[PDB]
Amino acid sequence: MKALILVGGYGTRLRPLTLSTPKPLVDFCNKPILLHQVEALAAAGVDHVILAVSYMSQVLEKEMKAQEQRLGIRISMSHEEEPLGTAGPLALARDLLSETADPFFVLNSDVICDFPFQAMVQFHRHHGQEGSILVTKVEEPSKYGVVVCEADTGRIHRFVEKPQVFVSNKINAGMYILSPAVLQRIQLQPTSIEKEVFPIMAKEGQLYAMELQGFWMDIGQPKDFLTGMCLFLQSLRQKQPERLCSGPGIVGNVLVDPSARIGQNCSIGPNVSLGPGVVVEDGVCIRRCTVLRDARIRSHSWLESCIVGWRCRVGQWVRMENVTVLGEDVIVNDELYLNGASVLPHKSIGESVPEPRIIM
Amino acid sequence: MLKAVILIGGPQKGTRFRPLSFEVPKPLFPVAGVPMIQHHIEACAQVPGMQEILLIGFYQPDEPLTQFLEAAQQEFNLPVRYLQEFAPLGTGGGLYHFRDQILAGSPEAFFVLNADVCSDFPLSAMLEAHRRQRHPFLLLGTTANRTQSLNYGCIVENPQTHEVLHYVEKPSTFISDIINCGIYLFSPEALKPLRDVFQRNQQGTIRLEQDVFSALAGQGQIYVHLTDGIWSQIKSAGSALYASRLYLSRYQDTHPERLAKHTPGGPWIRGNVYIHPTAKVAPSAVLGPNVSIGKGVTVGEGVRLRESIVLHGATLQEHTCVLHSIVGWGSTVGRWARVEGTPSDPNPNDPRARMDSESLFKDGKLLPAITILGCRVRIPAEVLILNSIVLPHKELSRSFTNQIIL
Amino acid sequence: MLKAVILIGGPQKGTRFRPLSFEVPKPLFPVAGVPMIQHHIEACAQVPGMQEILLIGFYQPDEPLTQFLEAAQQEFNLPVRYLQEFAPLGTGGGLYHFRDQILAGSPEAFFVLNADVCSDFPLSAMLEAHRRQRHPFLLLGTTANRTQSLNYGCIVENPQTHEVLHYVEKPSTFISDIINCGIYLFSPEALKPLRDVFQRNQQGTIRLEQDVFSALAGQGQIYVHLTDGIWSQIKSAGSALYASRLYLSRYQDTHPERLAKHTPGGPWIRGNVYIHPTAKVAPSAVLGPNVSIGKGVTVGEGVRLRESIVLHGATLQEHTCVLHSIVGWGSTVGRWARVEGTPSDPNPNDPRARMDSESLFKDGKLLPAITILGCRVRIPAEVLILNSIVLPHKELSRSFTNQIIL
């Protein structure tokens, strides 16, 4: 049993957070985004996980080895020297996955959902064909790749990577199980696996589909970060309601780290996650915001649907709304209103912004 | 024996949401290479026993229209005539006024086709259902979105007997999803109820949908034949471009010799592209999907054309990019010049989205849509035209953005 | 002996002035009752010793142009001839190309007048300075505002010697406060620099401002002469109203019989109002300031007109209010219909005025300007046309606000 995790791209994602820490490492409900997936892979029982990274990082290798014996499972990573698309990681890691004949998971870096892997491997063994794909019913399917399926067997009749015509409602959930025979199909030259090999495999009929149960969300967008965290808080409340804190001054689904310290008569609204080491003063109302680690917010401030970066000092009487992302080491002055401002790191702000624009 | 009546409009009744052409008639506008009513004429000539084709509309007979009639008569070996109303008599008034010319010869039934629709034209299927039941009115019907249905004429039917129980014309509220497609089949008895409507007007102009269809609905006189194929209405410029895309995709099943092949020695072609034989395209040019080129067009070295329509005699010089734009005839685009438009299109998440058309101004703001270049418009070198409507015989000198250039 | 050369444009130079211009060339547009070049011809005929007037343009001769020439010859007792360039030769290429027709008779000096300018035309005072200096180029100039001067040709002069030290044509940044009026006085030796430019172009179009005036400046060839009288240029359709206001205020010193008196038996009149003798005005109507009425115009009973030009053949029914608009030839306005516009004039001296742009749209919305109605536009009763441009032969059904009706 092996598993591949698809990292890279360096941009288009949650950029003010991605400038100081890589994308799979940024925290998401007090855990990194990669760490959720590899913990779920530990739950699945895979012996070995490889991750393809398009640029080498010191602190990522640091974090993954220091996590990697706490997990007790070795995890290796492969560096590509040109971005060979999303298919190139399969061909570069071919022999490492191909010395034994056992089907392997391929996971995107940004997908977070309920992880069905133990049921999905028995589905893969039962249907017996080459490639299995998780699919989910979504409301806006133009952004994602769209598959049509069968009634009972789940054979994928057609796969389109970008629809633009409404051929179906169900999308690629983003979780693949690939046989070793698919490794020899793809060449080392840069291709796209979601576009190229799944379409020819669909008209062959080796591709099969499986319906995910709940609360799938893509966390690539900086806007979709907040509603994905909002959905994950509700699903974790349904599964483990003890882990969410309950208090007289906090309402809704609140997930507080043990290292976080909160003042009194401050009203934390629904779907708020506080990182480790944050300090909230008295009289801060926070609704639908995530707060990353080491960040201190001053008193009497209102924050709706905001992302606060690490070691981020926020002034007194500060209002922030409309997916405003704060970055690495931002010092917002007192009595400022930020509507829609994503902030470049290591920058202090002196002017309240009426309209949403990137503050460099 | 059957003839077919095509209701081409008049000049005032077009009232274009974006003017696709300022100088040629709307029914002679080339959609996917051939004029707009030539699709109707060809699909009517394929039907067996088609004796004649009539065009009713109050255009004055300019020489382009009569020259098109010269060409079409000897192309399809059918007599194609033009009957001009003396005044704008409405949709069904021109049918009643010219009843002696249509009824002569005693046709078994006769088609009525709107000129502005772009459709599959399943005239044989409608003819088989009509030969089965011989009812006076047969209507083509299509399935539409709940929001988009308020623009067309909604039809409530009995699902078993396929008879209209209720008809309403552009309703303010949602009524039904089936919409009238502007294609009808008329038995010779069906000119009798029209006459009745005429007498009520004396106590001239008969609107066919509001006075005949919306009054006689439910009384066993109107039957709807549902259909499946492609359907759009050519109201605006963007809907003309989308209808041209629909016809270029339809061309694979009927005329594979019309679409340009890949041709690795010549110019690059991706997607469905119509190139005229007289047009000379340089081999370095690459023509993207859904592109029609007219007769006598000299597409230069290095041109990129995507989602465009180039009328006859236009010249594009080197390294120009033309995206989502209608280029009028005789127009010249200088080198490194870019003509761009915005494809409003249809929603990709909606199951049955029908691509609405909007009349040039959303709520007092000009909205971005297909760039129109008028006839004999000279775009100078290294200049950008974006989301603009350029009137004819105008030579620009600077870049224009989101403007109607008078 | 002196003659005058009036550079009228061609059909391409009148496209900026296009909505009104479909019916008649831009130089034959009636500004303050008479055609636009007729002011130039009349002010040249008022000069003593004017032998001939030549109009140089590339308009094709039709009945409006030659009918104007036949009228103006017998009106001013002067031969008015039209020389037609074979191609658009620029501002100075037409002057050089017809040099034998200009120098025929050996005149002592000849005036050169742009056709688009509305000005005082103080040609006599320029002549009295030219007889003092006898120099090749004399330029009428006027002071303008610091932000408005960038669109006109700027002249940096020495105040003591009255000589163009420097000339920059439509500069990006501020150069000088005086602008070129577009009225010049040419010696017969002034065709010697132009010839040199022609030779330089071969080793045949010559632009007068960009080639002759820019290189010749500062070398003793070009001299300035400053006027303080009224000056404006008619480059767009809404600038004709402002130039008509300037001419109607100029009319008191030159033609006191042209402006209508108050006439307490007849219609109430405030400000300067020109009424043609053929025009039928109801006595209940009141006409505000700066209003011109064409020939054969019927104005209804109770009508208000302020700052508006009503062209000839137009019909205003009763109880209507027309502010800031140009009502085209044969246009009809139904009862209780308001046609409004917002004031906007070149006004070079003023800082508030929006300066020349071909754009007409700021960010997808029409800028507030003068309402134009083209030829034969039928406005229905009880309907508002505000800030809107209506193309010719278009009948409207409902009230349009801030739109261009195509």
Ligand SMILES: Nc1nc2c(ncn2[C@@H]2O[C@H](COP(=O)(O)OP(=O)(O)O[C@H]3O[C@H](CO)[C@@H](O)[C@H](O)[C@@H]3O)[C@@H](O)[C@H]2O)c(=O)[nH]1
């Ligand atoms: N090494 C490497 N990895 C890459 C590269 N490009 C993308 N990846 C990884 O491949 C995954 C997909 O990249 P996206 O570009 O974000 O794809 P998408 O627009 O989100 O759509 C994909 O995911 C959807 C589900 O989230 C699918 O529905 C859709 O079909 C498609 O697979 C991401 O985790 C990204 O890290 C690359 O060039 N090199």
Ligand SMILES: Nc1nc2c(ncn2[C@@H]2O[C@H](COP(=O)(O)OP(=O)(O)O[C@H]3O[C@H](CO)[C@@H](O)[C@H](O)[C@@H]3O)[C@@H](O)[C@H]2O)c(=O)[nH]1
């Ligand atoms: N002879 C004549 N023909 C006319 C006249 N007015 C319109 N026509 C032609 O009749 C056809 C439809 O006329 P419209 O009145 O503009 O109908 P519509 O708003 O476009 O909608 C109609 O067609 C839709 C599909 O295109 C239908 O869905 C809808 O029910 C309705 O029938 C067009 O081709 C138009 O050119 C006229 O006065 N005289």
Ligand SMILES: Nc1nc2c(ncn2[C@@H]2O[C@H](COP(=O)(O)OP(=O)(O)O[C@H]3O[C@H](CO)[C@@H](O)[C@H](O)[C@@H]3O)[C@@H](O)[C@H]2O)c(=O)[nH]1
């Ligand atoms: N014969 C001929 N006449 C022409 C041609 N082109 C223009 N004219 C006439 O020449 C005059 C000005 O031509 P433009 O090229 O449009 O100049 P402009 O933008 O109006 O600016 C000129 O006049 C301004 C005052 O009106 C000046 O301020 C400016 O510096 C410049 O001289 C107008 O009467 C125009 O009709 C031509 O090609 N041939």
